[PDB]
Amino acid sequence: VLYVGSKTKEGVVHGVATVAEKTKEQVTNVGGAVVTGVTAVAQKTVEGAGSIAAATGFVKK
Amino acid sequence: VLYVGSKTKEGVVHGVATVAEKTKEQVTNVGGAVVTGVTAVAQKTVEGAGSIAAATGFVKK
Amino acid sequence: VLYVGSKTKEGVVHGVATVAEKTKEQVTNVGGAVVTGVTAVAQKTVEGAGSIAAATGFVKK
Amino acid sequence: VLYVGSKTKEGVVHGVATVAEKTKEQVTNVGGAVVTGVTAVAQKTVEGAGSIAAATGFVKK
Amino acid sequence: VLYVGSKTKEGVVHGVATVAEKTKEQVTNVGGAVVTGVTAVAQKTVEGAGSIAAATGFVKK
Amino acid sequence: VLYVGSKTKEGVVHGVATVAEKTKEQVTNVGGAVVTGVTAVAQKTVEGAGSIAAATGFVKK
Amino acid sequence: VLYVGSKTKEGVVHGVATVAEKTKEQVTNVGGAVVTGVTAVAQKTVEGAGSIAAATGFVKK
Amino acid sequence: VLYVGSKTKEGVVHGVATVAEKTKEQVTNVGGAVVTGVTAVAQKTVEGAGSIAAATGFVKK
Numbered sequence: 465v466l467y468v469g470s471k472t473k474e475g476v477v478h479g480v481a482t483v484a485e486k487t488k489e490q491v492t493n494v495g496g497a498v499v500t501g502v503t504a505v506a507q508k509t510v511e512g513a514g515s516i517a518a519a520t521g522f523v524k525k
Numbered sequence: 526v527l528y529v530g531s532k533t534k535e536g537v538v539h540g541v542a543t544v545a546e547k548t549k550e551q552v553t554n555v556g557g558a559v560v561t562g563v564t565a566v567a568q569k570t571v572e573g574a575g576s577i578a579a580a581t582g583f584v585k586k
Numbered sequence: 587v588l589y590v591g592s593k594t595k596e597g598v599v600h601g602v603a604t605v606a607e608k609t610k611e612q613v614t615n616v617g618g619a620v621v622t623g624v625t626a627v628a629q630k631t632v633e634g635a636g637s638i639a640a641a642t643g644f645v646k647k
Numbered sequence: 648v649l650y651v652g653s654k655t656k657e658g659v660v661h662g663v664a665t666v667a668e669k670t671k672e673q674v675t676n677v678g679g680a681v682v683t684g685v686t687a688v689a690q691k692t693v694e695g696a697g698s699i700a701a702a703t704g705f706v707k708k
Numbered sequence: 709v710l711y712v713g714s715k716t717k718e719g720v721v722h723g724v725a726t727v728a729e730k731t732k733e734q735v736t737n738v739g740g741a742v743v744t745g746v747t748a749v750a751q752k753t754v755e756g757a758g759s760i761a762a763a764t765g766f767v768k769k
Numbered sequence: 770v771l772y773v774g775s776k777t778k779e780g781v782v783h784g785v786a787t788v789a790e791k792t793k794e795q796v797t798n799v800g801g802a803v804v805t806g807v808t809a810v811a812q813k814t815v816e817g818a819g820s821i822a823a824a825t826g827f828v829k830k
Numbered sequence: 831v832l833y834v835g836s837k838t839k840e841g842v843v844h845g846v847a848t849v850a851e852k853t854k855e856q857v858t859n860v861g862g863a864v865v866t867g868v869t870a871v872a873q874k875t876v877e878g879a880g881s882i883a884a885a886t887g888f889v890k891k
Numbered sequence: 892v893l894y895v896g897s898k899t900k901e902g903v904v905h906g907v908a909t910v911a912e913k914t915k916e917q918v919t920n921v922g923g924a925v926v927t928g929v930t931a932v933a934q935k936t937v938e939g940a941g942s943i944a945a946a947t948g949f950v951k952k
């Protein structure tokens with residue numbers, strides 16, 4: 465009955481340095497799912513599913 | 526009955542430096558799903574599904 | 587009845603330095619799922635499934 | 648009834664330096680699931696399944 | 709007699725990302741010389757002295 | 770008599786990522802010379818002295 | 831008489847990632863010379879002295 | 892008479908990752924010379940003295 469939060473962190477990203485030097489980056493997709501290059505991502509979910517970088521081929525029900 | 530939040534963080538991204546030097550970046554998609562290049566993203570969901578970089582091939586019900 | 591959080595961390599990423607030098611990066615997908623290059627990702631889920639870099643081939647029910 | 652958290656850490660990644668020099672990186676997927684290159688990832692799940700880098704071939708029910 | 713320069717670089721700085729988070733930065737100088745915080749500086753000198761971040765206490769001739 | 774330069778580099782800095790998190794940075798100088806924090810600096814000198822981060826106490830001739 | 835330079839490098843710095851987390855950084859100088867924190871520095875000198883991070887106490891001639 | 896340089900390197904630094912976590916860094920100088928923290932430095936000198944991190948107490952001629 466006396467919750468006291470103070471300077472708390474939940475789902476936090478900080479202090480990120482990235483260098484990426486490429487000559488050729490190619491993605492070829494035929495009927496599927498491709499996720500590429502996810503950087504410095506943060507989230508908080510309450511009462512639900514939390515997905516960040518999810519690829520599902522297909523759902524053929 | 527006495528929740529006291531103070532300087533709390535939930536789903537936070539800060540301090541991000543990114544350099545990307547590419548000569549050729551190509552994406553070719555035929556009937557699928559492609560997600561590429563997600564940087565410095567933050568969210569908070571209450572009572573729901575929270576997705577950031579999600580690719581689903583297809584839903585053929 | 588007297589929860590007192592103070593400077594706590596849950597699902598936190600900080601202080602990350604990355605260099606990536608490639609000449610050719612290629613992804614070829616035919617009806618599947620490919621996830622590539624997930625860096626500096628943090629999340630917190632309450633009452634749900636938490637996935638970061640998940641690839642599912644397909645769901646043929 | 649008197650939980651007192653102080654400077655605690657749960658699912659935390661910090662102080663990570665990575666260099667990756669490649670001439671050719673290729674992924675070829677035909678109807679499966681491929682996950683590649685997951686770095687500096689942290690999460691905390693309460694009352695749910697927590698997966699980071701999971702690849703499932705397919706679910707044919 | 710046939711100098712042919714092509715895409716040459718001399719005194720060049722490029723691709724620099726910097727983050728600096730400080731709570732207190734102080735400089736106290738009494739009769740001296742202080743240089744602080746020189747970032748991403750480039751020069752080319754022909755037939756002369758080239759100095760970038762030089763501090764000389766004093767010249768009492 | 771047929772100098773042919775092509776894509777040459779002399780005094781070059783590139784691809785630099787820096788993070789600096791400090792609580793207190795102090796410099797106290799009394800009659801001297803202090804140089805601090807020189808990052809990503811490049812120069813080319815022809816027929817002269819080339820100094821980057823030089824501190825001389827004093828010159829009492 | 832047929833110098834042919836091609837993709838040559840002289841005094842070059844590239845691909846540098848640095849993280850520095852300090853609580854207290856102090857410099858106290860009384861009549862001397864202090865150099866601190868020189869990162870990712872490159873130079874080329876022709877027919878002269880080349881110094882990068884040089885500290886001289888004093889020159890009392 | 893037919894010098895042919897090709898993809899040569901002279902005074903080159905590349906691919907450097909550094910993390911430094913300190914609680915207290917102090918320098919106290921009284922009439923001397925202190926050099927501290929030189930990282931990822933490259934130079935090329937022709938017909939001259941090349942010094943990188945040199946500290947001289949004093950020159951009392």
Ligand SMILES: Cc1ccc2c(c1)sc(-c1ccc(N(C)C)cc1)[n+]2C
Pocket residue numbers: 465466467474508509510526589630631632
């Ligand atoms: C007094 C009281 C009772 C419940 C209570 C709190 C305080 S604080 C809290 C909470 C719930 C979910 C989450 N996430 C989304 C990670 C974080 C915190 N609850 C559930």
Ligand SMILES: Cc1ccc2c(c1)sc(-c1ccc(N(C)C)cc1)[n+]2C
Pocket residue numbers: 508509510526527528535569570571572632
């Ligand atoms: C007084 C009181 C009681 C409950 C309570 C709060 C305050 S604040 C809170 C909460 C709910 C969901 C989330 N997320 C979306 C992660 C974060 C915090 N609850 C559950």
Ligand SMILES: Cc1ccc2c(c1)sc(-c1ccc(N(C)C)cc1)[n+]2C
Pocket residue numbers: 465467587588589596630631632633691692693
């Ligand atoms: C007063 C009180 C009672 C319970 C309580 C809290 C405060 S805070 C908390 C909690 C719940 C889920 C999570 N995650 C999502 C890992 C982290 C913390 N509980 C369960």
Ligand SMILES: Cc1ccc2c(c1)sc(-c1ccc(N(C)C)cc1)[n+]2C
Pocket residue numbers: 587648649650657691692693
């Ligand atoms: C007084 C009281 C009662 C329960 C209680 C606490 C305090 S704190 C806590 C807790 C639950 C889940 C997690 N994870 C998600 C790792 C971390 C902490 N519980 C369950």
Ligand SMILES: Cc1ccc2c(c1)sc(-c1ccc(N(C)C)cc1)[n+]2C
Pocket residue numbers: 709710711718752753754755813814815876
């Ligand atoms: C045809 C010809 C002859 C000489 C010649 C050139 C072209 S270009 C050049 C030169 C001089 C100084 C410098 N710096 C300031 C480092 C760089 C290059 N020289 C000496």
Ligand SMILES: Cc1ccc2c(c1)sc(-c1ccc(N(C)C)cc1)[n+]2C
Pocket residue numbers: 709770771772779813814815833874875876
């Ligand atoms: C034909 C010919 C003759 C001389 C000659 C060249 C070509 S190119 C060159 C030169 C001089 C100084 C420098 N630096 C400042 C490093 C770089 C290059 N020289 C001196």
Ligand SMILES: Cc1ccc2c(c1)sc(-c1ccc(N(C)C)cc1)[n+]2C
Pocket residue numbers: 770772831832833840874875876877935936937
């Ligand atoms: C045709 C010709 C003849 C001489 C010649 C060149 C080309 S290029 C060169 C040279 C001089 C100084 C330096 N530094 C400053 C290290 C690097 C290279 N030389 C001496």
Ligand SMILES: Cc1ccc2c(c1)sc(-c1ccc(N(C)C)cc1)[n+]2C
Pocket residue numbers: 831892893894901935936937
């Ligand atoms: C044909 C010819 C004659 C001389 C000659 C060259 C080619 S190339 C070269 C040279 C001189 C100094 C340096 N440094 C500064 C390390 C590097 C290279 N020289 C002296």
